[PDB]
Amino acid sequence: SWEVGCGAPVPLVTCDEQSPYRTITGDCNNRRSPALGAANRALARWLPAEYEDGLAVPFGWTQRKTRNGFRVPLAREVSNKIVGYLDEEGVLDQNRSLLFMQWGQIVDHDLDFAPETELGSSEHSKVQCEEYCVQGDECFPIMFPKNDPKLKTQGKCMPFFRAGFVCPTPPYQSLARDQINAVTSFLDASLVYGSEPSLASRLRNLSSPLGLMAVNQEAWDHGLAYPPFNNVKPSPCEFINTTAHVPCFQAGDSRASEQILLATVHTLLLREHNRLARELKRLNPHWDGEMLYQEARKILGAFIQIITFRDYLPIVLGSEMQKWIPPYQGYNNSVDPRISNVFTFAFRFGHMEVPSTVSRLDENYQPWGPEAELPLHTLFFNTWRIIKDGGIDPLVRGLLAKNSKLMNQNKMVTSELRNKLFQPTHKVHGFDLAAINLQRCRDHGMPGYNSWRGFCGLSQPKTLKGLQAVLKNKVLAKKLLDLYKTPDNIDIWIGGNAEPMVERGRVGPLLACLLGRQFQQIRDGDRFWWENPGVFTEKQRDSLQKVSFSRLICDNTHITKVPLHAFQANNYPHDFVDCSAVDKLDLSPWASREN
Ligand code: HEM
Ligand SMILES: *[C@@H]1O[C@H](CO)[C@@H](O[C@@H]2O[C@H](CO)[C@@H](O)[C@H](O)[C@H]2NC(C)=O)[C@H](O)[C@H]1NC(C)=O
Ligand SMILES: *[C@@H]1O[C@H](CO)[C@@H](O)[C@H](O)[C@H]1NC(C)=O
Ligand SMILES: *[C@@H]1O[C@H](CO)[C@@H](O)[C@H](O)[C@H]1NC(C)=O
Ligand SMILES: [Ca+2]
C-alpha cells in the first residue's frame, strides 16, 4: 500500500449515527468507513491509473514519450477528424425528448465534479497559459493541429488546466495522482443543497422558521421563485451581455447556469423544495425550520432517485439494464458507493445528445415570439433570457416538445460545443468540448479502450479489422486506427462513444457496463436509498411511487398540459393531456400528530 490513507480532508467530521437525515457532505452514510461516498475525497480507481511517468503526468505531455510505442494524437485533431460534422438535418432522436438530454446532465452533476486546480487567484500562470500557450505545471494547453481553422483565428492553443487532486494541491505525488470528487457520490440532491455546510446554509432562508430555500428578491416569474443571484463578480453571466447586467444563479451546484436549460431545471427543483415545505407545515404546523427543510430535502432526493432509476436509466441502458442493475435487494454495507474516476468520463456520452438549438414555446406550444429558436452557443452562462425574455415556462415547454440529438458515428458532437464553447474567464465563444474531454481522460490518467473492454469482459480488437467488427463501421475504424495506431491507445471517451447503441438504450456495450455498474453501486451503497426498508414508511413509499416529471412541471409552473412519459418524444397536442389527469404526490402520509 502506497499510502493506506492520505491527507487534506476535513478532520472535524463526526457521526451522530442514529439521525434520520443524510449529512450535506455525504459523510456518515457508511458506518464502517464514514468517508466513503463523501465530497472532497478522491474518485475511486476501478483500475490503476495510467500516467506517462506512472505517477501524475499525462500521456501526450512529453512528445517523444510514446504510449505502447506510438504517439497519442492531439485531442483537437481527434476532435476535427472524428467528432465534428456540418449538417444538422437528420440528427434528432425520433424517440428521445430534449428532457432526456437535460436529465442526464442534472443527474451527472449530482454525482460528480472534478474541478480545475487553484492558486490561480492572482495567477498570470492562468494567463501565461492563455497568452503564450506554454505547457507547464497544471497548465496543460490543447494545441491545434496544422490545418485547423483556429490557428488562423484564435491563436496556437485552447487553454486547459489540470484537474484537482488529493493531498498536496500544488504540486505533488505519489501516490499516483488521484483526482477529487467535490460532490457527494450518493444520488442525494447535492445539486440543489450544496455539498459543503458553508454553501448549504448560505442558501437556506434562515430569516424565518419555514424551512424554505432562499429565493431571488430582485426578480420574479408570475410570482414564482427564481434561484438567487451569485454575487461573485467576476461573473460570466454578466460577461455574456454587458448591457443586460444579469449574473448567474446560486445553487447547491456550481454549474447551474452553464446553459439556460440546465439553469431552468435547477429552477423547477428549488421550487419543489419550497413548494413542499409549505405543505409539511400545513399538515404539521408544529414542525420547526430544520424539520421542514430536512424532510422536504429528503422527499427531493427520493424524487430524483425514482425518476433516475425508474424512468431514465432503463431508457439509457436498454437491454443491458438487468444484466447490470437487477431489482433492488436492500442496503448492502459492502458496496463501495464512490463514483469512479472513469464514470465521470462514461457519463459524458450525454455530450453527443445535445442539439444545436434551444426553443421557446407558447401556450399553444408554438414558436413564442420572433426569435424562439436560438443557437445553443448563445445560451452558455445565459440567465438574462430567462428573467428578461418572459420566463421559464416556455423553456420547459421546449423541453417536452423538442427532441434530443441522437448520437451518430458520422455526427458525434455539435459545433456549438465543438467550436463555440464559452468557458468562464476565457473570452470567446471558441472552445471545444470534445477536445476538453480527451485532454481530460489523459489528465485523469485513464486506461485506454482495450483495458476497459477487458474490464467489462468484452473482446479487445488489435487490428483495423478487429475494430471494424466491434464498431460496425469501416471508415470510423480506419480514422481511429490512423490516429491512434492501435486500439490499446484509444481514449475511453471516444472509444466508448464510438460503439453502436445497444437495443432500446442510448449507449454501447462498453458504456452500458461502465454506467450500469456505477449506478448499481450508488443504489446499493446508499444507507438512505428511498426503498431501503426503514427509511420511509411503507405508506410514504406508495406515495412516492407515483411521482412523475410530468407532475413536477404541473406543480411548479403554469403549464397545464403535459406528456405522461416526459422522456420519450412527444408531439403536441396528441401526446398531451391536462395536468388534472396526472397523479399527485400525496403528502398525507407525512402527518406527525403529537396526540
Ligand atoms: C448543453 C449541455 C452541456 C454543456 C454545455 C456541457 C459542458 C461541459 C463542460 C464545460 C464540462 C467540463 C469539462 C472539463 O472541463 O473537463 C463538462 C463535463 C461533464 N459533462 Fe457536460 N455539458 C453538457 C451536457 C452534459 C450532459 C447531457 C451530460 C450527461 C448526460 C454531461 C455529462 C458531463 C460529465 C459527467 C462531466 C464531468 C463532470 C465531473 O468533473 O465530474 N454533460 N460538460
Ligand atoms: C442584452 O440584453 C438586452 C435585454 O436585456 C437585449 O436587448 C433586447 O433585445 C430586443 C431589441 O434588440 C428587445 O426585444 C428587448 O426588449 C431588448 N431589451 C433592451 C433593454 O434592449 C440585447 O439583445 C442583449 N444583448 C446581447 C448581445 O445579448
Ligand atoms: C424568507 O422567508 C420570508 C417568509 O416567507 C420571506 O418574506 C422572505 O422573502 C424570504 N427571504 C429570502 C431572502 O428568501
Ligand atoms: C453485498 O455486496 C457484496 C459485494 O458484492 C456481496 O458480497 C453480495 O453480492 C451482496 N449481498 C448481500 C446479501 O449483502
Ligand atoms: Ca450527490
UniProtKB/Swiss-Prot annotation:
<dbReference type="GO" id="GO:0005509">
    <property type="term" value="F:calcium ion binding"/>
</dbReference>
<feature type="disulfide bond">
    <location>
        <begin position="456"/>
        <end position="513"/>
    </location>
</feature>
<feature type="binding site">
    <location>
        <position position="186"/>
    </location>
    <ligand>
        <name>Ca(2+)</name>
    </ligand>
</feature>
<dbReference type="GO" id="GO:0046265">
    <property type="term" value="P:thiocyanate catabolic process"/>
</dbReference>
<feature type="glycosylation site" description="N-linked (GlcNAc...) (complex) asparagine; alternate">
    <location>
        <position position="332"/>
    </location>
</feature>
<dbReference type="GO" id="GO:0042744">
    <property type="term" value="P:hydrogen peroxide catabolic process"/>
</dbReference>
<keyword id="KW-0044">Antibiotic</keyword>
<feature type="active site" description="Proton acceptor">
    <location>
        <position position="109"/>
    </location>
</feature>
<feature type="disulfide bond">
    <location>
        <begin position="6"/>
        <end position="167"/>
    </location>
</feature>
<keyword id="KW-0732">Signal</keyword>
<keyword id="KW-0963">Cytoplasm</keyword>
<keyword id="KW-0944">Nitration</keyword>
<dbReference type="GO" id="GO:0004601">
    <property type="term" value="F:peroxidase activity"/>
</dbReference>
<feature type="glycosylation site" description="N-linked (GlcNAc...) (high mannose) asparagine">
    <location>
        <position position="205"/>
    </location>
</feature>
<feature type="binding site">
    <location>
        <position position="190"/>
    </location>
    <ligand>
        <name>Ca(2+)</name>
    </ligand>
</feature>
<feature type="binding site" description="covalent">
    <location>
        <position position="258"/>
    </location>
    <ligand>
        <name>heme b</name>
    </ligand>
</feature>
<keyword id="KW-0325">Glycoprotein</keyword>
<keyword id="KW-0964">Secreted</keyword>
<feature type="binding site">
    <location>
        <position position="110"/>
    </location>
    <ligand>
        <name>Ca(2+)</name>
    </ligand>
</feature>
<keyword id="KW-0349">Heme</keyword>
<feature type="disulfide bond">
    <location>
        <begin position="129"/>
        <end position="139"/>
    </location>
</feature>
<feature type="disulfide bond">
    <location>
        <begin position="554"/>
        <end position="579"/>
    </location>
</feature>
<feature type="binding site" description="covalent">
    <location>
        <position position="108"/>
    </location>
    <ligand>
        <name>heme b</name>
    </ligand>
</feature>
<feature type="disulfide bond">
    <location>
        <begin position="15"/>
        <end position="28"/>
    </location>
</feature>
<dbReference type="GO" id="GO:0005615">
    <property type="term" value="C:extracellular space"/>
</dbReference>
<dbReference type="GO" id="GO:0020037">
    <property type="term" value="F:heme binding"/>
</dbReference>
<keyword id="KW-1015">Disulfide bond</keyword>
<feature type="binding site">
    <location>
        <position position="188"/>
    </location>
    <ligand>
        <name>Ca(2+)</name>
    </ligand>
</feature>
<feature type="glycosylation site" description="N-linked (GlcNAc...) (complex) asparagine; alternate">
    <location>
        <position position="95"/>
    </location>
</feature>
<keyword id="KW-0560">Oxidoreductase</keyword>
<dbReference type="GO" id="GO:0016323">
    <property type="term" value="C:basolateral plasma membrane"/>
</dbReference>
<feature type="glycosylation site" description="N-linked (GlcNAc...) (hybrid) asparagine; alternate">
    <location>
        <position position="95"/>
    </location>
</feature>
<keyword id="KW-0106">Calcium</keyword>
<feature type="binding site">
    <location>
        <position position="184"/>
    </location>
    <ligand>
        <name>Ca(2+)</name>
    </ligand>
</feature>
<feature type="glycosylation site" description="N-linked (GlcNAc...) (high mannose) asparagine; alternate">
    <location>
        <position position="332"/>
    </location>
</feature>
<feature type="modified residue" description="3'-nitrotyrosine">
    <location>
        <position position="365"/>
    </location>
</feature>
<keyword id="KW-0597">Phosphoprotein</keyword>
<dbReference type="GO" id="GO:0019732">
    <property type="term" value="P:antifungal humoral response"/>
</dbReference>
<comment type="similarity">
    <text>Belongs to the peroxidase family. XPO subfamily.</text>
</comment>
<dbReference type="GO" id="GO:0140825">
    <property type="term" value="F:lactoperoxidase activity"/>
</dbReference>
<feature type="glycosylation site" description="N-linked (GlcNAc...) (hybrid) asparagine; alternate">
    <location>
        <position position="332"/>
    </location>
</feature>
<dbReference type="GO" id="GO:0036393">
    <property type="term" value="F:thiocyanate peroxidase activity"/>
</dbReference>
